[PDB]
Structures are given as C-alpha cells and as structure tokens.
Design a protein around this ligand. Structure first.
Ligand SMILES: [Cl-]
Ligand SMILES: [Cl-]
Ligand SMILES: [Cl-]
Ligand SMILES: [Cl-]
Ligand SMILES: [Cl-]
Ligand SMILES: [Cl-]
Ligand SMILES: [Cl-]
Ligand SMILES: [Mg+2]
Ligand SMILES: [Mg+2]
Ligand SMILES: [Mg+2]
Ligand SMILES: [Mg+2]
Ligand SMILES: [Mg+2]
Ligand SMILES: [Mg+2]
Ligand SMILES: [Mg+2]
Ligand SMILES: [Mg+2]
Ligand SMILES: [Mg+2]
Ligand SMILES: [Mg+2]
Lengths: 197, 189
C-alpha cells in the first residue's frame, strides 16, 4: 500500500528541506520512497513555459494543471500502486493558494479543473510549513516566475494556505516554520509514525 | 466591427486550404484580416512540446487550453478590437471533437475548463469541412477514432446550428470557397 504525502508553504518556509529530510529518513528505515515536486514533476518543460512574459493567470493555472495531470498519472499513482511513500514538494494546494487566493482566480473553477486533472487524488497528509510572508521573503529570493509581485501577494497566499488548512483539518498538519529545523523534522516524523508503521 | 471566424474538421478536410483562401480573398478586398491557428497561436512552445511520450489526454487538453487562453487574450481579442476579421484554423470545437468525442474525456468538464480559458468568446461562424476519415486520410490511432471525431463534429453542429456551417468537403475547392464567401458576404463590414 502506498502513501501520498505533500509539503506546502511559501518559498523559504523549509518545505523543500523537510521533504528531502523525510525522504532520507524513510530510506534509512528501508522504505521505498519517491521524492518529487511541482511544478515540473509531470512535464519538466512547464518550468520553462512558466517564464512567458505577461502570461495570463488562467494560462499559468492551466499549464500547472497539465503538468499536475501527467504528474499524477505517470509519477504519483504508479508509485503508490508500487507501495512507495510518494512525497511531493507542492501539489494542488499550491495552485489554490498562489493562483486562487494569490492571483484571484475563482476557486470553484480551479477545483472543477483539478477534479479530472488529479483524478480526485488527495494526499493522506499535508505538511504546511507556516510563517509570516515578511519572514519568508527575507530567507530567500522569490522564483524568477514571481517577480514584481509584492508583499501583499504573499500575504494573500499565506492566508489562503491557512484557509485551506481550516477547511481540511484532518489532512493539513500546520507547523510553525520559525521553530528550529530539528523540531519541525521531529514533528513531521511524529505525525507519520502511526502511518509508517 | 471585428469578426471572429473559425474553420474546423479532420486534418486533410481542406480546412487549412480554405482558411488560407478566405484570408487571401479578404486581403484582395482590402479588408483587414488576421489568420491564426490552434494549437500554437497563443503559446508556440505548446506545439513543439506536444509530441511527448504517451501524454495523457487530460494533460493534452489542459495544454491546448493554456495555449488557447493566451491565444484569445493576446491575439484574437486585440484583433477583433482592431476591427479585423480574425480567422482561426481550429478553435475550441477541435478539442471538443478530438479530446471529448474522440478520446472520451467528459464533455461537461471540457466546457468548465473552456469557460475561463476562452472568456466565453465564441466564433460568429464556424465552417466545418465534413468528410469521412478515409477521404481525409487519403489526403494526409485507428479509423474508429477518426469516425468518432467526425461524428462529434456533426453533433456539435446539430447542437449549435446557427454557428456551424456544415460543408461537404469532397466538393471541389472552388465551390467550397464560393460557399464560404457567400456565407460571409452579409456579415461584412
Ligand atoms: Cl522552502
Ligand atoms: Cl488535494
Ligand atoms: Cl524571522
Ligand atoms: Cl480533512
Ligand atoms: Cl486540413
Ligand atoms: Cl465555441
Ligand atoms: Cl447556434
Ligand atoms: Mg527549504
Ligand atoms: Mg522532515
Ligand atoms: Mg498539498
Ligand atoms: Mg489542477
Ligand atoms: Mg503538530
Ligand atoms: Mg484598426
Ligand atoms: Mg471552432
Ligand atoms: Mg479550452
Ligand atoms: Mg465532421
Ligand atoms: Mg451557438
């Protein structure tokens, strides 16, 4: 039986680091793992196409969705059927936070599109590394994709993630990303222990 | 005002030929015209890429849709705002025909996706060059697939009869071109 886990948060939150550490932990326990990420896990060329000038938010979401559709069908679902713990650094939630709450695309449309794109595949758990957007922005420069975009954009993203976590409190594990790195890794692993076992 | 026209049908139906005939005819009259096409009219790199190993139909449609979203916003709407006749060789109907009726993706989903992608922009007329696959294949995935696509096109046309001008694409090119011009005549300017 596979297990689908995701990690989410602003760039700089630590989700990338924690995704890697979790993979390495499970590998040390003899468990097969697939460590992946969006965007690019399905169609790597979408990472390039996402640097098109003045790209509409709609087309941006649809390109992310095409990538995610391949990601689910070619990478994630086969890994799960193979019994792996498939860990994605970003999944659907990132599109809802960034393109929904961030860019203002209507959420019902985002979800109508995602319904087939994902085949309804949802993570068993999702680790949200939460922290203030001012704090995120100081840790690391933004993706080339997200320049111009100001503090208020990132606030809407941060709050959107938190609204997603409120609606799906069983799925979302919200962690304070200003805790020490070891403490976040400890908490992630504590959440996973009864599942892996 | 501007005028949005599309051409549709199987590859090898004469759709591209007629698209070009129509543009040339409008240029000969001194009528501003923009000839474009899908896929590639919005994001050319979607065309190049498209050739990806065993690409899911869902992902394919989503990529077409990203292309189509940029096409409508950056190319077609400005053209129409300039008072041009904008002619697209393929538009939404192609994705509905091929991905929907052909590959079996659910039609209501396809249209949910399209509603924002196209901002609701529909062609004033859509010339469907209808013919059997065998005739199309003669000129340029099984036969059964192409039949499903052809029949889907006819189902679209029956649902939207005012918009679809169904033409028998086995007729001589000139007779088709003359027909297309006759359908257009009262719309200009
Ligand atoms: Cl990060
Ligand atoms: Cl989800
Ligand atoms: Cl801080
Ligand atoms: Cl939940
Ligand atoms: Cl053709
Ligand atoms: Cl349409
Ligand atoms: Cl109609
Ligand atoms: Mg990190
Ligand atoms: Mg960890
Ligand atoms: Mg997620
Ligand atoms: Mg999606
Ligand atoms: Mg906790
Ligand atoms: Mg003008
Ligand atoms: Mg059309
Ligand atoms: Mg579309
Ligand atoms: Mg037909
Ligand atoms: Mg109609």
């Amino acid at each position: 039986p596979g297990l689908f886990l995701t990690l989410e948060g602003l760039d700089g939150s630590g989700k990338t680091t924690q995704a890697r550490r979790l993979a390495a932990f499970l590998e040390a326990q003899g468990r097969p793992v697939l460590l992946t990420r969006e965007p690019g896990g399905g169609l790597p060329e979408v990472r390039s196409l996402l640097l098109t000038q003045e790209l509409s938010p709609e087309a941006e979401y649809l390109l992310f969705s095409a990538d995610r559709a391949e990601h689910v069908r070619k990478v994630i679902l086969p890994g799960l059927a193979a019994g792996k713990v498939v860990i994605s650094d970003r999944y659907l939630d990132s599109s809802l936070a960034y393109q929904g709450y961030g860019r203002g695309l209507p959420l019902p449309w985002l979800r109508e599109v995602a319904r087939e794109a994902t085949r309804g595949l949802k993570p068993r758990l999702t680790f949200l590394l939460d922290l203030p957007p001012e704090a995120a922005l100081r840790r690391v420069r933004r993706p080339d994709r997200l320049e111009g975009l100001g503090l208020e954009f990132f606030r809407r993203v941060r709050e959107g993630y938190l609204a997603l976590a409120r609606a799906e409190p069983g799925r979302f594990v919200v962690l304070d990303a200003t805790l020490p790195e070891e403490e976040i890794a400890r908490a992630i692993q504590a959440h996973l222990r009864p599942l892996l076992p």
